[PDB]
């Protein structure tokens, strides 16, 4: 199985056979496959290399934008860089340094609390870096943030879904802006607004278009409710979801097969009135058939994680305060990566 | 009801609507609203109750990736000048690996 895939990769991009020994397939995702390979350096020792084979249905501008994120933003501040890139026709392979890393699920229950602090700090370093360039990653989640516990090394990876802010410094992301473009009624309004009613007027309206590339369980509420003007705040929400998994011991934390089920789960954690209030500020009316109160984050996480030893026995208030700011339902007030690095949770750190 | 398209949503539900009223609302109806399950063992979600795609080059849906990639339309795009934007970025990277000559069979 893996053997035929490797043989086919050498056939697809023949230059690889003169440079790399492809040893194994380490990743299989929606838009790429990633292989472990060994190469010799002209001036250094042998190196392990991650070869990312982009799906050949990818548009060339999308391929180039991913590469440009890696070359311009990557290579420092815990953002993966690129060593080289090989192309034959529609087959593009990005060669990156291989970072040996933990499985998030495997280490979730053995991380010390101090290691959770260090992990979050270094995630925010990476997000501060990409957000400075106006990159909205859109798919912040543990499999896109590689962590080597022993070496204390971190790498944000995978710019295959990224979009640009209006401000972006990644030239090619001006061709993939996060601001949606809408498609192409006898009565504009109807009496169903903010009620449980439906009628022929509202049901027959066109559909709103908004970006939503990403992964189920990590999308911010403004994504789930089809806000056409999304910002780097969606990445900070996703970082909040990672933190919520770390503090609760539960991963994946949310488990939903569609956007409004994900929203219903968020309302069950953060409260329905709180979610409704925030959504009004970005132009969305949410109605739920039952009101549910916000959960206290400390009680929730500690009850789901169970008895704490060592650092886990006395998690500081600052941790749940930072979590509350990351999971801010209002994307305008949600904490930024730059601000998060200044939060008291990170007292006495680098 | 369904014939007149007018009525009320069966509960429980979530309904979302853009406040401009320009767009169709979207709805969620499920049998059970989410329940936080603290009994299920970690690391499980407290909400746990348990080759098709689109070619961006051809602007076409496909049901089998490998089949689409072999189609004549996709091959023509793959072999075109549309990737100059990629090659322009590559030409600024520095190649620092050892490159071997091809091995030719002997005798």
């Amino acid at each position: 199985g893996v053997k035929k895939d490797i043989e086919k990769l050498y056939e697809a991009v023949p230059q690889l056979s003169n440079v790399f020994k492809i040893e194994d397939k380490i990743g299989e995702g929606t838009f790429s496959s990633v292989y472990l390979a060994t190469a010799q350096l002209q001036v250094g020792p042998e190196e392990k290399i991650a070869l990312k084979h982009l799906i050949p249905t990818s548009h060339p501008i999308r391929i180039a934008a991913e590469l440009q994120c890696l070359t311009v933003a990557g290579g420092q501040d815990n953002v993966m860089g690129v060593k080289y890139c090989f192309r034959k026709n529609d087959h593009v392979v990005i060669a990156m340094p291989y970072l040996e890393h933990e499985s998030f699920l495997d280490i979730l229950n053995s991380l010390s609390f101090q290691e959770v602090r260090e992990y979050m700090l270094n995630l925010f370093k990476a997000l501060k870096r990409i957000h400075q360039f106006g990159i909205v990653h859109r798919d912040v989640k543990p499999s896109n943030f590689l962590y080597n516990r022993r070496l204390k090394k971190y790498a944000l990876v995978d710019f295959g879904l990224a979009q640009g802010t209006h401000d972006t410094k990644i030239e090619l992301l001006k061709f993939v802006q996060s601001e949606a473009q809408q498609e192409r009624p006898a009565s504009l309004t109807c009496d169903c607004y903010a009620t449980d009613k439906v009628c022929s007027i509202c049901l027959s309206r066109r559909q709103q278009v908004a970006p939503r590339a990403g992964t189920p369980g990590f999308r911010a509420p403004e994504v789930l409710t089809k806000c056409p003007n999304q910002t780097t705040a969606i990445d900070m929400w996703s970082a909040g979801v990672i933190f919520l998994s770390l503090l609760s011991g539960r991963y994946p934390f949310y488990k939903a097969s569609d956007d409004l089920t994900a929203l219903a789960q968020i309302m069950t954690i953060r409260g329905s009135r709180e979610t409704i209030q925030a959504a009004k500020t970005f132009g969305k009316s949410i109605l739920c058939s039952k009101e549910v109160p916000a959960q206290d984050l400390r009680k929730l996480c500690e009850r789901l994680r169970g008895a704490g030893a060592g650092g886990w026995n006395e998690v500081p208030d600052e941790a749940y305060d930072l979590l509350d700011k990351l999971l801010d339902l209002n994307p305008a007030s949600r904490i930024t990566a730059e601000e998060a690095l200044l939060h008291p949770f990170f007292k006495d750190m680098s | 009801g369904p014939g007149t398209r007018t009525g009320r949503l069966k509960k429980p539900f979530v309904k979302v609507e853009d406040m401009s009223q320009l767009y169709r609302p979207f709805y969620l109806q499920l049998t059970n609203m989410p329940f936080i399950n603290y009994s299920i063992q970690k690391p499980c979600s407290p909400f746990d109750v348990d080759k098709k795609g689109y070619c961006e080059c051809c602007l076409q849906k496909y049901e089998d990736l490998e089949t689409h990639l072999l189609s004549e339309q996709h091959r023509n795009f793959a072999q075109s000048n549309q990737y100059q934007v990629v090659d322009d970025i590559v030409s600024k990277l520095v190649f620092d690996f050892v490159e071997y000559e091809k091995d030719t069979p002997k005798k």
């Binding site: 501008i61 992964t215 189920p216 | 689109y54 961006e56």
Partner: peptide, 9 residues
């Protein structure tokens, strides 16, 4: 936990 099938452009 893979990405959804669709993305922009």
């Amino acid at each position: 936990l893979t990405a959804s099938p669709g993305r922009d452009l």
